[PDB]
Amino acid sequence: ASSHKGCLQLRDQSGSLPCLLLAKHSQPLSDPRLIGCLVRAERFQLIVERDVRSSFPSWKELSMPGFIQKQQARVYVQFFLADALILPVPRP
Amino acid sequence: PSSEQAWLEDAQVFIQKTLCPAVKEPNVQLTPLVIDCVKTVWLSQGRNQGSTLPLSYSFVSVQDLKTHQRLPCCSHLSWSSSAYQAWAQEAGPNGNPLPREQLLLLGTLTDLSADLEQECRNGSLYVRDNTGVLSCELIDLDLSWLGHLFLFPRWSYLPPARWNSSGEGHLELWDAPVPVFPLTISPGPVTPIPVLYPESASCLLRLRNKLRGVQRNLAGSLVRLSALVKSKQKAYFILSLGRSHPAVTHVSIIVQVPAQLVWHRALRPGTAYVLTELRVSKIRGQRQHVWMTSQSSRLLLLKPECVQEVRYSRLLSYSGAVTGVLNEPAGLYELDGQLGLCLAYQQFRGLRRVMRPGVCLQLQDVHLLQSVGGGTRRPVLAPCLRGAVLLQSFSRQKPGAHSSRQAYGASLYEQLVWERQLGLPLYLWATKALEELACKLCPHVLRHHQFLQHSSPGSPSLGLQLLAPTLD
């Protein structure tokens, strides 16, 4: 849990990935004891959102390549917490 | 040069201090005998630099070698620049040969472990002197050599790599050990010793009612040798005696004598031997009977002078050399850079110390597997408990250094092999997944040794827990 924006994340040595976790059957994630734990998921969804600022003149020039200016993406993960496994980290 | 006389006096004092036996009074003639033997070995090669004595060599005790040496080193007698360069070129120009030393060692070749003589009768070869005992490995040996002083012209010492290893070290000998003094060689059995050929032994085994406490003698050609099975307190290995060409019929013999366990290092395939005073033994759960080695039994050779009358794996025997190391803890190695070798299903606790890249191995009764799948493509040879691995030549390249940081995970792999009883493709996939997990998490999240720790009760390993959902 980030201490600058209050957004849940899944992090390893490689990097980070925003996540949206839910409890079983339409219930919010409420227990704050999962901070620092290890989460393993076998069934999860990868969601990508696309934002494009186009300037297409009409339908004829749809396939032309010079009519796209700005492109962006946004990737996060959604999965239920019932289908996942939580394992504590054995701190020394 | 008074330096030669000073060195000779130092050698004399060293012999007096840490080589004179404490049981008998020190016979003063031991030092001239040792000096004469050293000079004869020095002059036999005929490559001395004008000096009758090797001024460059200095005596060092076993304890001194253990306490002072901190790096791998190989010391040999009469090795000038030319011989050392030839040895290095033989080792392979790509690899870095071990550094050369000029030292002298004297010790006794004994199978005894330590002061606890019978408490650790594992059959290992040990070099013991007054200072202590240090392990050694020999390609071949003779039973008459044990219990006597021997001069070592060639040796290599390898200290432990990682500080978490309890092994003190080991030594490797290349050439035959030169005897320091004439050993009292006892004569053999003068009277002829009749034996039973494998056909006659098989015929006797066919007679189930005619094996009631009869002490006979059997002989034949060694066909198959089994691995040294280790149990809680008993160690036994089985040798197969049968007439070769055609090697169709063979008779099994189980060796269980503790003091004779050193025969595991002596017997070699193909040669025919003679075994005397063998009785009948019964094994629970096996209808057949296997001959038992008696306490008063001796190992003899066949001397005609006095011996009167879903897929499957293709078993085969292979010979080759080790070139690359894939996973040291899991016993995965590459043969000639083309074939993979898996020692997981044997008990190779004593193979890691000696075997390394630059070693030629002679395998017997190994299984060839193809199209294993699961991320690997090259065929892998996986010997089982039926066969054995015989070392042919030692290596000359230095051991790797990175293994001192990311290699020790052995306990988990052997637990996977033996406790869960996993198949070979599952074992390979498990090793690959464990490497991936270690790269992903370690070392900031968890230390390398913590992640692959032994799965003792009260502290299960995280890797096994993570791998359980697929393995189950």
For residue A81, the distance in angstroms to the closest alpha carbon of chain B comes to 16
Q: Which residues of B292-311 are buried (b: 16+ CB within 10 A; e: fewer)?
A: bbeeebebbeeeeeebeeee
CB contact under 8 A, A40 and B466: yes
B235 and B229 Cβ atoms separated by less than 8 Å: yes
If you count residue pairs, one on A and one on B, with CB atoms under 8 Å apart, how many are there? 23
Q: What's the number of CA atoms in the CB half-sphere (13 Å) around residue B102?
A: 12
CB contact under 8 A, A13 and B469: no
Omega before B246 within 30 of 0, i.e. cis: yes
Distance CA B360, CA B392 (A): 6
Of A13, A85, A92, the CB nearest to B441: A13
Q: What's the number of CA atoms in the CB half-sphere (13 Å) around residue B335?
A: 19
Annotated resolution, angstroms: 3.4
Distance CA B403, CA B328 (A): 8
Omega before B160 within 30 of 0, i.e. cis: no
Positions of E strands within B82-172 = 100-101, 103-104, 106-110, 126-128, 133-137, 149-151, 154-158, 170-172
CB contact under 8 A, B469 and A85: yes
* Chain A contact for B466 (CB, 8 A cutoff): yes
The H or E element spanning position B275 is: strand B272-282
Distance CA B217, CA B198 (A): 11
Taking Cα atoms as reference points, which of B297, B163, B302 lies closest to residue B219? B302
Report chain A's C-alpha Rg in angstroms. Answer: 19
**Secondary structure (3-state) at B125:** coil
Sorted by sequence, the CB contacts under 8 Å of residue B11 that are 6+ apart come out as: B31, B34, B35, B59, B104
Distance CA B172, CA B158 (A): 8
CB contact under 8 A, A89 and B440: no
**Secondary structure (3-state) at B199:** helix
If you search the block for the tokens 């002078």, which residue do you land on?
B305
B64 and B58 Cβ atoms separated by less than 8 Å: no
For residue A13, the distance in angstroms to the closest alpha carbon of chain B comes to 6
Angstrom CA distances, A88 to B28, B32, B435, B461, B464, stand at 71, 70, 21, 12, 14
CB contact under 8 A, A85 and B445: no
Eight-class DSSP state of B398: P
Instruction: List the beta bridge partners of residue A87.
Output: A38
Ramachandran angles phi, psi of B412, nearest 5°: -65, -40
Instruction: Kindly state the tokens that stand for B471.
Output: 């393995």
